[PDB]
């Protein structure tokens, strides 16, 4: 709820001290424009969780659901047209694209100019990550590390 | 159009049954009558970044049996392209220039999907990434146990040895598992069994399966044994001699043996099967080798070809 | 001068584009509290450059003098007691320790265990960087890529 | 009878502009309408006393799509032949019994010259000797930046890297000094610079030449762009890195760039060509290496034929 | 006399308790008042048939600290005697005229207990035969718990890592099998857990002992926490990595553990141990590397002497 | 206390004028009267993770004429330690533990300085990182330029060779540039001279320096010549030979030469110093390797003596 412009694509309440990876990630500071970053407050439905918007962004639908296995519970309520005109909150995707490395070390992927791409599956108990390239399935806990 | 024109065959999963059964059913016809100069003028690359001849051999040959001519290498860390610092996605991004379709072993896994990206038009057939697939042997391995069996349903099926790291085994039982009824006995020592998430897939799709600790409780329910080597270091001095001989077959246990019954191996052996059960008829592993010409030669005619003409 | 709490250590002014970088080689995030980032604003001497304030945090004088080849020009102004009571600007130090990256491909610290560290020397023509290690001295635009 | 018929083509100052002209109108011909039976029943060698990959798939796929036949050798250290103490001559004096053409790439220099006198009536086609040359190679640069360019006169051609070993943009520079008009632009490291025997050609000639620290003052003059590595050794531990950088391209410099420009290398590149300018339309490397079966098809048609009927 | 002058300390459980006991206070003593010319004169064989320069440069200090003169060998593959065809056999017996201990290390098993029957008069210590004996990292191991825990009974003693094939976490469990009281908790990966010959042991002589997936539940009651390495081979790509982060001892787990409380590895490490643990109090590798050289005199002085004077 | 007990020596330029004049003073002490059980029963050791034997029997005989004992390696690619994974740093570790002296050369820089980070209080004698120090063959050639020159200032020399990469001439200019006077002659290929940041620290001390194209030019006027080689690879076959022969040394050059002058060669040579240079009174580099000894000696006896008593 914390000062920040009217207009931009607003994200909201980040878990327990993510959001500065976040914002390394799915990198959101080349596209350039305020980028109000909130960070390690007191927020909704928590009372010390993280968050932040942007001005001038929009995330596709898809763009939101990349966030899903970092925190899942998360507005991303945009401040349409002159204000809050748009909720959402992400669920786990079909395929994460970049971001995640394999852990298996044989794995071609180390060694190259190629996106890195794991399709997800379990959609609770134990999320599981298929490889796109050496079609290993690891526990999403282990594929977090990083 | 081919269901398969163009198409890279990288995994056994990536196919679905209606286009393995136009895999087997084509490798029956041009087995039947040969078609020598269908591939005439297509040019091939043999890329074995990871030698082994004897996938080699039977791939080059069956590019010829066709008519095509064949360019490549065996590389044994001494071939200029893709090792100095040139990475292997520029590697086939200059072979997919002068060629036609990529023939490909490698080390690392995923290495014939990355070639994919970067091959174009090109189809990319995977002669064995890692520890991750060879499509092409165990499209020869059901293309055996049907010619003998005359059906790949409703068979009792062993599987015999290092089941827990043996790819070999575990990609023909997810294959296997697209068809109907089909029991499975898996037969292994205490600590290399059959891994756990084959076990699972196999228990969604309902389909029957055992444990034994021999082929001396299973010889007499068995159509197929597909036999694997157990190996020395995998296991421990002395648990290795103890259980080892329950995992050798010689011709001694094909006593109860069925008539159909049918000895197969992905080879090369060593040991676990005697030279005794080689006389036996139930010995096809030296037949199912052979089959692998006509198992591979399909996959380059269907990819090679709209319009398949046999 | 945008929205933030009273008591923390102000980081202010941060050129074209950085702010996301110097959160990420010090390891500002590590140490929580309220961490007000700014980013991507108009500011004081220049209208259009990154800054952004925390609470609780007090670095040093050499905790500051290290931002000196990445920003020179940077107000860190204390909001001491209650209020503002102590302004700084960063010059270049004797030795910028962490952070950077040798050079050269033989060095043994991309090898190991060891803390990378550069003796700082010209203090403006062309500010030469040598390694503690293999000791090579390169410009600082070469070490600056990373 | 052809002006190449026999003929031993051994370097690039060998031949002369009007057959460099023959060769490059026949490339472009043969890609128009292939002849995949013309060199049907010849038998050619692929000797490479020096291991290369990307030169000998190139060269033997070449030999292929003319119908011929290969036998051959990628030796390191093991080949009997021309090895234990067999002279290279009465190496040659064997092979040139049966074969009909052969390919030669060896460590030493004049190794394909000392073939020629020594092979009779078999024509020996060098496939780059030590430091010397390497004349299908400049053979297919020329025949790529006149399919892009539309001409090999008056045009604006930059050279990049390490220009004083680098044997590729040595000898593209005095084949295109056959022709007239042509600036030329040398970028390099200030001790790796060009080598003065050829600025001193260059000059006796009356061809232009300007020397630059960086491709950022030569972007919007350039017609082609010719890249090549510049080594670690070659320089100095912190000399390269100082320097390193002006001799990268990254796509964000192929802002003022002409239309018509092409970024060509000879490849394999490292780092010095990024993967952004790969998708950009001025990246040409790839195709340049596709062309050199055309180039190198050429030379094998013209030499093993009198009546070139195409 | 001693009790050991002139034996060959081949195996730990050819040793009893009472020397046992005899090697370990005599460590303690010579580390406390050094005897720099003890074994002034005497000549001993460092013979290295495989190498390990670890081991080496211990044993071999350990012969200078009591002043003993050095002759020997690393081999690789490279070394005149005992390879061309010569017996193992017949090298001891001429190395076994000219020195006065032979020290060695070897590929297969028994090589040193093979030693034994033909060096005669001259004792034989066993630097580690091959999947067998390595008794002098044993000696070091409880020289080191009790160095710090001031005793060899009724403690707490994990076990972290690859319990089956790892001898060296074998043969610790074994000689601390003849004191009393002593809990053993063996973490292992469910493929790679604790053989059942040794668990058949511990229970016959009665002593307590666990099993557990982390060191997770174990850290508060633990005194030992002897660490050792999973190996990548030994398990699945996949399951190797689900696993593998129980098996890590980063400093955070430190949080409950005692006072006492050492953290033990035979050594190398990889990543197993983290950099981390290093400053902490309980980190104490290191130092148990240091000993090797107060265990491994000992054996040497008692040996190689009758009267030890100390 | 000296003023180097305990002190690691890695550079030349990490020592300082007065502890360079106390390393030469002790040296030609110890020269006169030997001491031959300074260091008995210290033990000291030589890791060369870099094989060089020549620096190797040269400090290890260096620390047996003062009595001490030596354990160590020349490994290449085999030695199990600070190979497999195990860090450098945890190999420095456990050696730390039962040396008393470290001895190191290894391929990568600043190895040694790493070393200085986990030995403790050991110190470390640097016989070579990579491409950066080798401080004991400076102080070993700064012992003989004033062992024959009777001082290390107001001097004439001579600096022939690869001047670029040379370190071993770099860094006897800087060692020489603490002193006073001293002029400096570089001799060397157009392309392989000394680097300009040397020049620019000649320059701000104010010392005298030439620039030259042959020793023909130098002869009469130089006091030391120090020679070194100029490779093959760092120029072109044929730059090479047109400059070699002004870089090569015969004795016949040896004409206008001073008295005093000496020929001095960090060694081995090849061919740029002939045979009949040798005979004649101003060849001293086989003394100025025997000088090594002395060096060599010095540094150790400093480095592990607090109380000097020569
Ligand atoms: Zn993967
Ligand atoms: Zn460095």
Redesign the interface.
């Known amino acids: 709820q914390?000062?920040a412009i009217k207009r931009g694509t607003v994200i909201d309440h980040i878990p327990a001290?993510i959001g500065?990876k976040l914002?390394?990630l799915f990198k959101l500071?080349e596209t350039?424009?305020?980028?109000?970053?909130?960070?390690?407050?007191p927020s909704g439905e928590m009372g010390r969780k993280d968050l932040?918007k942007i001005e001038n962004t929009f995330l596709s639908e898809d763009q939101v659901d990349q966030l899903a296995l970092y925190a899942p519970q998360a507005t991303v309520n945009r401040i349409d047209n002159y204000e809050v005109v748009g909720k959402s909150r992400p669920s786990l995707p079909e395929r994460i694209d970049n971001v995640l490395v394999c852990?298996?070390?044989?794995?071609?992927?180390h060694?190259?100019?190629?996106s890195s791409s794991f399709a997800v599956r379990k959609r609770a108990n134990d999320i599981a990550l298929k490889?796109?390239?050496?079609?290993?399935?690891?526990?999403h806990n282990?594929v977090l590390?990083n | 159009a081919n269901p398969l024109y163009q198409k890279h065959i990288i995994?056994i999963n990536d196919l679905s049954r209606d286009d393995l059964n136009l895999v087997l059913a084509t490798a029956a016809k041009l087995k039947a009558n040969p078609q020598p100069e269908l591939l005439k003028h297509k040019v091939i690359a043999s890329c074995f970044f990871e030698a082994s001849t004897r996938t080699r051999l039977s791939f080059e040959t069956s590019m010829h049996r066709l008519g095509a001519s064949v360019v490549g290498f065996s590389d044994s860390a001494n071939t200029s392209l893709g090792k100095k610092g040139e990475?292997?996605?520029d590697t086939i991004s200059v072979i997919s220039t002068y060629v036609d379709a990529i023939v490909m072993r490698?080390?690392?896994?995923?290495?014939a999907?990355?070639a994919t990206?970067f091959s174009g038009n090109v189809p990319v057939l995977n002669a064995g990434?890692?520890?991750?697939?060879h499509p092409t042997q165990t499209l020869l391995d059901l293309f055996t146990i049907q010619e003998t069996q005359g059906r790949l349903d409703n068979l009792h099926v062993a599987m015999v040895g290092d089941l827990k790291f043996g790819r070999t085994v575990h990609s023909l039982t997810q294959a296997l598992a697209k068809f109907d009824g089909n029991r499975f006995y898996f037969i292994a020592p205490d600590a290399l069994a059959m891994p756990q998430?084959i076990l699972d897939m196999l228990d969604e799709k309902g389909i029957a399966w055992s444990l034994h600790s021999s082929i001396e409780e299973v010889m007499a329910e068995v159509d197929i044994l597909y036999m694997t080597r157990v190996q020395k270091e995998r296991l421990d001095p002395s648990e290795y001699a103890n259980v080892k001989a329950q995992f050798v077959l010689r011709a001694s246990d094909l006593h109860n043996a069925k008539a159909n019954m049918k000895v197969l191996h992905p080879l090369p052996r060593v040991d676990e099967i005697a030279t005794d059960v080689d006389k036996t008829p139930h010995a096809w592993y030296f037949q199912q080798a052979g089959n692998g010409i006509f198992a591979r030669q399909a996959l380059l005619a269907l990819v090679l070809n709209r319009d398949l003409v046999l």
Chains 1, 3 share one sequence.
């Open positions: 914390v000062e001290q500065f914002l390394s500071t350039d424009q305020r980028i109000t970053i909130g960070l390690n407050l932040i852990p298996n070390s044989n794995c071609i992927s060694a190259e100019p190629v490889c796109k390239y050496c079609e290993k399935e690891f526990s282990v590390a | 995994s990475t292997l996605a490698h080390p690392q896994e995923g290495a999907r990355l990206e990434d890692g520890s991750n697939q998430y």
